[PDB]
């Protein structure tokens, strides 16, 4: 616990932004996966 290097926070607005970005990334991956199942 005395090692200094082992010890080498986020606000709320950026938390909302991160959650929204996670949402759009999920939607994009969903549509990308749907695109590979289309009929040929």
């Amino acid at each position: 616990s005395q090692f200094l290097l082992t010890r080498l926070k986020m606000s709320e607005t950026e938390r909302q932004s991160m959650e929204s970005e996670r949402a759009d990334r999920s939607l994009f991956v969903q549509e990308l996966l749907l695109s590979t199942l289309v009929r040929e």
Partner: protein
């Protein structure tokens, strides 16, 4: 493995100090160069194949197939322990007011806790003197001679009625034979029985590797002869150790094939068990 704190401080200071780009480039180059050199050493080591194969099969602490034994890896940090004197005692002789003891070998003694039981009001000890020496002798009566061959360690005075006393040594002493003297107020000369009280001894010690000191010329000659004998024994043991490698490589070659064998601690592959017995059993010893 001794340089954990050094690299900790080096990383911290390099991270906290603002520096020019040239210094940063030099530092990164040094780090990457050391890493590359160590990786190259690892991948071409003669024992690298054996260790790499053994790592995933057996559980072993150290590397016991090294030509030159490493002083760093051979010398771990041994801690002190509480040892009772009688467990390491070999030969003992008592006199009217002293006690002389010899141990199995050398020891690095730090503290001595002395306990007293079945004491009587008739007579008790007021001053205890401790003596030590690191000269190995075969007969206690030979070392019984008082003045010349002893060193003063500590003098402790006791309040009347004391039962336990803590003889602390500011500097740990490397000793092989010990002596306790009752300076101020008893013991049987033949058997050492004491009717006034019963004394028990404890030590805060750990095993130590040391030899007798040299004071004159015949001692130097004895040291040279002893070192020659030790070198011969070490050479024999080293050859016996290095003789194990062909069998280990044969077993590794057989294990690599992984051929199924028909017949739960006994249901492991026989070659894996032989590998474990050969490495962790004999090479370790």
């Amino acid at each position: 493995r001794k340089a954990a704190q050094f690299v900790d401080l080096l990383g911290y200071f390099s991270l906290k100090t603002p520096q020019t780009e040239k210094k940063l480039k030099e530092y990164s180059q040094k780090a990457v160069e050391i890493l590359r050199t160590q990786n190259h050493i690892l991948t071409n080591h003669p024992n690298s194949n054996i260790y790499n194969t053994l790592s995933g099969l057996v559980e072993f602490d150290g590397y016991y197939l090294e030509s030159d034994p490493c002083l760093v890896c051979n010398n771990p940090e041994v801690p002190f322990c509480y040892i009772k004197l009688s467990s390491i005692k070999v030969d003992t002789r008592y006199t009217t007011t002293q006690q002389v003891v010899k141990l199995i070998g050398s020891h690095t003694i730090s503290k001595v806790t002395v306990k007293i039981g079945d004491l009587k009001r008739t007579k008790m000890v007021r001053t205890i003197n401790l003596y030590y020496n690191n000269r190995t002798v075969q007969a206690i009566v030979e070392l019984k001679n008082k003045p010349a061959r002893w060193h003063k360690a500590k003098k402790v005075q006791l309040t009347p009625g004391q039962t336990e006393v803590k003889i602390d040594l500011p500097l740990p002493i490397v000793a092989s034979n010990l002596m306790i003297e009752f300076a101020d107020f008893f013991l049987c000369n033949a058997c050492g029985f004491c009717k006034y009280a019963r004394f028990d001894f404890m030590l805060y010690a750990k095993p130590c590797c040391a030899v007798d000191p040299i004071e004159n010329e015949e001692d130097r000659k004895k040291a040279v002869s002893n070192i020659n004998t030790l070198l011969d024994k070490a050479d024999r043991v080293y050859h016996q150790l290095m003789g194990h490698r062909p069998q280990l490589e044969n077993l590794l070659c057989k294990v690599n094939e992984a051929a199924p064998e028909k017949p739960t601690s006994a249901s492991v592959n026989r070659y894996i068990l032989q590998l474990a017995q050969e490495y962790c059993g004999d090479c370790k010893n």
